Curated annotation (Swiss-Prot), chains A, B:
It comes from Tursiops truncatus (Atlantic bottle-nosed dolphin). It is found in: Cell membrane. Residues 513-666 form the STAS domain. The record marks R387 as: Contributes to anion binding. It holds the Pfam family STAS. It comes from the Eukaryota. Residues 94-97, 136-166, 219-231, 237-249, 292-326, 377-384, 418-424, 472 are extracellular. The keyword Transmembrane helix applies. The keyword Membrane applies. Residues 232-236 dip into the membrane without crossing it. Residues 1-67, 114-125, 272-279, 350-358, 395-398, 448-455, 487-675 are cytoplasmic. The record marks S386 as: Controls the electromotile activity. This is Prestin.
Length: 675, 675
């Protein structure tokens, strides 16, 4: 009507090509673009400093008026949750518990200096601690009888110190690997961690942490498992040793568990203006240690206890390097899983607040944290998932909440430690299990991805199962590979639709979707929303033949049967005119004379796709049906040209700019044929 | 001009949707389509019989007049090449050589009954024989001293028989696995074997066969290697034991090698009308055995010899099944690699002649061949690559060439065998090495895929290297995974191009490609030829901001700096009109008022892509720039709707049917704004 007036000639490929002339587009010194900048410009230097060491821009652009309160409250809460988590993951690392406080202190300040994620908290992260403990057990097994010299009982201090040394070596190697990956721009790999992949992976990690804390909650001594089917073995071992437990350890653990669930529900449900997310975990830990000490619980009823915490800050003893030959593989595994968890949580919390986390810079910061921690008697670190959620939800505006947690841990390690000596391990297990609630709430993503899109649900469930039953490392690798497989599947099951023309317009849409579209007579239009490549070409050809209802093989068979019933410079022609007897013995099907293949949606093709297109064109030409490509893009035209599809026959004339151009060209030649 | 006259109203999404009404499209009993056919129709029964047991259609549709000559000549040549190849692969399987003739006899007739590939020959295929020999060595090592009873020298017959039993068990398991995969429609996986993948894999297999035949060519006894870096270990072992060789074995081997190369060049170069591809290999083997016997070569100069061939056809002794517990994994590996090689060669020879090979039916036929062979004292089988090329090139029109080879092997095993007793292993090694020439000629694909397309070259080289250095099994798996990774890369590096309008038409093409396209004033058009999904969204957004030259963040910064210099039911609005002071202090850039995102090429999106589009629209709306989606397909519109992108705001009005519709709608609203 009033608008959209075109009045333009028929643009086949040769017409549009002769209409317009190419440009130069060849810029000089291309491919060596970054060689010739290398400048000492102040802006570039400040940008590099901002990118490597972001605290140069964190501090000056600080907003006191509200961030002071936000970070104060969030840091208080996150350090409160940090102390018991650090202790529990330390005792789970087969390392004396104070090294958990060291790991909760040093890497936090190092990340503050070098990290970019606003809402993140850095600590032991029990699965990393599990791998560290498995390595320590492997290198320093329990049965080792060392000639100490005093000829006394087999004190565990020597074995514990050897395990600590193993932890130092492996964590230093992970730090070095992480830094080396970070400088070499490996953080780009963090783009393959989808949202459902991250959700499933973190939920599997939460299930791992739960099944790990089970054995301390029950007060049961069981053999430590690590590797593949680790969670299954841990759970079955706990259930096999469900007998001979410690009834009082369960009593205190479940008591603090129930009171802590009640407190969390009280604190979340009854949210008001002035009330803040009270530090429940500190109350839990102080009541637990008070009950344990007042009732002599460790010596009366034989409950497992944290034990003695050697006070003071130890000097930076340089670690050994001769255990790398034995720990390189598990150092690689620890570094990979730590980076994956850190970037996954930093990204899923950056999505909520709209800021960009550089995966490479996260990797560099995490590696430097791990290395300096190894220098300062610290095992490997990562992002604590539950503490990250707690710091985010409480309103941590900057990294200063992490700093506040670090200084509270510093207070615990310098002044106190007399106090938390008599603390049941059940209290720590209950605290960790309760704080896994934020991770466990991610199971609501199953109905969501069921309604929204089942490919994302498949990614979620596959990541969850693979990451739960295998380790987080192998589970993560297989989950990423399968998430990438989903794209191949999505290009392997396209939507082949036959198009029909909206009357007296140029709009071509699905014939069997809107009933106001009547396909133009004697023309069939095919349309695939996928690239035509090796994993897709045969399906595309078969679908064309099936859906258009025009199979050249059946047509040739019909010609042969009709003939049977009748018994009563280059030499190139791309179109064999039909030498039929001009009879009706063939089935009275449609009299289609051309087929238009819509390549607007076809992103690319490779050699197999071009071969199958040559086959399609040749077959339909042999039967007597023209084939037109419509809307071929420059990428697709180049992919057709590189392969020997245009040996300059009248094949460059089969291409048209759009579907309507192809329809009009076919109608024009059909009218010309009647002349 | 004369044609292409549209004269149609502006079709935004709501206008086109209200113009036309949806159909039903809901067919009854959908999703259970194959439940309600289950017919005894004669056509369906004959189709099923043709599909499972194709010899029912091979024989009746046979064309004597030319296929008789073709199959006669091709069968003669292929059986001639079959005999020495069978013997060599048998002695390489750590199995006495006659079982090579059994393997060359029974599975060939079984495949004739059940196989679909016209141009294929079935035999031992030295790498499969290598895996079989490795399994036999593992289960029956050389050092085993069995109490035979005669208390004589440690005769190898008992050890050889135990190795044969192991071969029986493993090949029966491979046959069962292959059949079970074939019935369960596993042959669809053969669609992921690209052309370059197949070429690289078969060239790596040829290199494997060459390095395997080296040690028999040199007459050197070396430890057998199998597994990962197998070829490297075999070659380094041969070169380490390059000393203490057998000079006469090398003499005869290189003599027949040179004469055979000369004969092959004579036979191929001097091709004429009446001359046929003479059976060179039979002359080679007969001269070799004549020289070995006449000069007493095995006992005079100590050359390795084929040995005695126990005459006659052995009865179908049923194999044991208690070795499955030990050989299941290598049976799976053998079945996978055998199917991969068979389908790869059958497909690459079906491409030359234009006929379809059902991967599932190939798998079923190969499994039945392996199983019945295990019943008849046969080790595992596959498609011989060199013999497949020889049968194809000589002009094998049907499977009867395979039958002729099988009957010639039957003649060798029933009548002769007295003769080939004194045959040097060097002659067989030279024959195999010479016949690897067809596979080695595939190295010409490197310049071809260098000029044509470098993704295919990357697939070729990666498949070759991975399949050569790892085994064919792990190499094949990694090659397939990387070939699928290339599609992810191809969607991760699209061609972002800014479009410009061809004057007074509706054709929009690249601005910096043709210099006759002038972009419409105050509009920027962006265009990606890729899906917008998780691995692609951030790159797409950054590329839009960079290439269009319109970054909302820099624009907001410019507004803030201008303000600084000045110091001298639902509540939804998708477009924040600019509250500027109406001043020029901002940089004098373009005054773009809308950005049109071309989604014609966008095949699909997932949750991450829809999130980044919501972000893009929100950002540009906040700055004061409209964003229009142009050409969204039904798949993309559904992907936008499932995710909460249309919460029925004026967002369903941002979609337009085509680029020109979006341009005209933006110009219309801009004109209306001036009112």
């Amino acid at each position: 009507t009033q608008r959209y007036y075109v009045e333009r000639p028929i643009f086949s490929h040769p017409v549009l090509q002769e209409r317009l002339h190419k440009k130069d587009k060849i810029s000089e010194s291309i491919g060596d673009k970054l060689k010739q900048a290398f400048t000492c410009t102040p802006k570039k230097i400040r940008n590099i400093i901002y990118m490597f060491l972001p605290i140069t821009k964190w501090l000056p652009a600080y907003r006191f008026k509200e961030y002071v309160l936000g970070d104060i409250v969030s840091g208080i809460s996150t350090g409160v949750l940090q102390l018991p988590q650090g202790l529990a993951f330390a005792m789970l690392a087969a390392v004396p518990p104070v090294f958990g406080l060291y790991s909760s202190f040093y890497p936090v300040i190092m990340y503050c200096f070098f990290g970019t994620s606003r809402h993140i908290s850095i600590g032991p992260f029990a699965v990393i601690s599990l791998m560290i403990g498995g390595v320590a057990v492997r290198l320093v097994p329990d049965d080792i009888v060392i000639p100490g010299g005093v000829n006394a009982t087999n004190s565990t201090e020597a074995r514990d110190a050897l395990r600590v040394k193993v932890a130092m070596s492996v964590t230093l190697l992970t730090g070095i690997i992480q830094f080396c990956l970070g400088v070499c721009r490996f953080g780009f790999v963090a783009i393959y961690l989808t949202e459902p992949l991250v959700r499933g992976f973190t939920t599997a990690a939460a299930v791992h942490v739960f099944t790990s804390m089970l054995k301390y909650l029950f007060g049961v001594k069981t053999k430590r498992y690590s590797g593949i089917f680790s969670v299954v073995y841990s759970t079955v071992a706990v259930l096999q040793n469900v007998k001979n437990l410690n009834v009082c350890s369960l009593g205190v653990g479940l008591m603090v568990f129930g009171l802590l669930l009640g407190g969390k529900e009280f604190n979340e449900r009854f949210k008001e203006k002035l009330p803040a997310p009270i530090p429940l975990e500190f109350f839990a830990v102080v009541m637990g240690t008070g009950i344990s000490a007042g009732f002599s619980l460790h010596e009366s009823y034989n409950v497992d206890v944290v034990g003695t915490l050697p006070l003071g800050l130890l000097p930076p003893a340089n670690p050994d390097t001769s255990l790398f030959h034995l720990v390189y593989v598990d150092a690689i595994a620890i570094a990979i899983v730590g980076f994956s968890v850190t970037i996954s949580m930093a990204k899923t919390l950056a999505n909520k607040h709209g800021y960009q986390v550089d995966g490479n810079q996260e990797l560099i910061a995490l590696g430097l944290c791990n290395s300096t921690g190894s220098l300062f008697q610290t095992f490997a670190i990562s992002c604590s998932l539950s503490r990250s959620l707690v710091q985010e939800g409480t309103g941590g505006k900057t990294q200063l909440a992490g700093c506040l947690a670090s200084l509270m841990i510093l207070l615990v390690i310098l002044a106190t430690g007399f106090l938390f000596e008599s603390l049941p391990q059940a209290v720590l297990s209950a605290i960790v299990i309760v704080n896994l609630k934020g991770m466990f709430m991610q199971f609501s993503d199953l109905p969501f991805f069921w309604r929204t899109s089942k490919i994302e649900l498949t990614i979620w469930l596959t990541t969850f199962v693979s990451s739960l039953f295998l380790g987080l490392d192998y589970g993560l690798i297989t989950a990423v590979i399968i998430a990438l497989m989903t794209v191949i599947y999505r290009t392997q099951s396209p939507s082949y639709i036959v198009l029909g023309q909206l009357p007296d317009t140029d709009v071509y849409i699905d014939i069997d979707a809107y009933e106001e579209v009547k396909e133009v007579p004697g023309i069939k239009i095919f349309q695939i929303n996928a690239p035509i490549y090796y994993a897709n070409s045969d399906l595309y050809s078969s679908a064309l033949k099936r859906k258009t209802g025009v199979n050249p093989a059946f047509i040739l068979g019909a010609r042969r049967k009709a003939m049977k019933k009748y018994a009563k410079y280059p030499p190139i022609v791309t179109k064999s005119t039909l030498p039929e007897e001009l009879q009706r013995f063939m089935p009275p099907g449609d009299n289609v004379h051309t087929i238009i293949l819509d390549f607007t949606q076809v992103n690319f093709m490779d050699s197999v796709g071009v071969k199958t297109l040559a086959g399609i064109v040749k077959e339909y030409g042999d039967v007597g049906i023209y084939v037109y490509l419509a809307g071929c893009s420059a990428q697709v035209v180049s992919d057709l040209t590189q392969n020997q599809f245009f040996e300059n026959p009248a094949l460059l004339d089969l291409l048209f700019h759009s579907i309507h151009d192809a329809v009009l060209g076919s109608q024009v030649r059909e009218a010309l044929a009647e002349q």
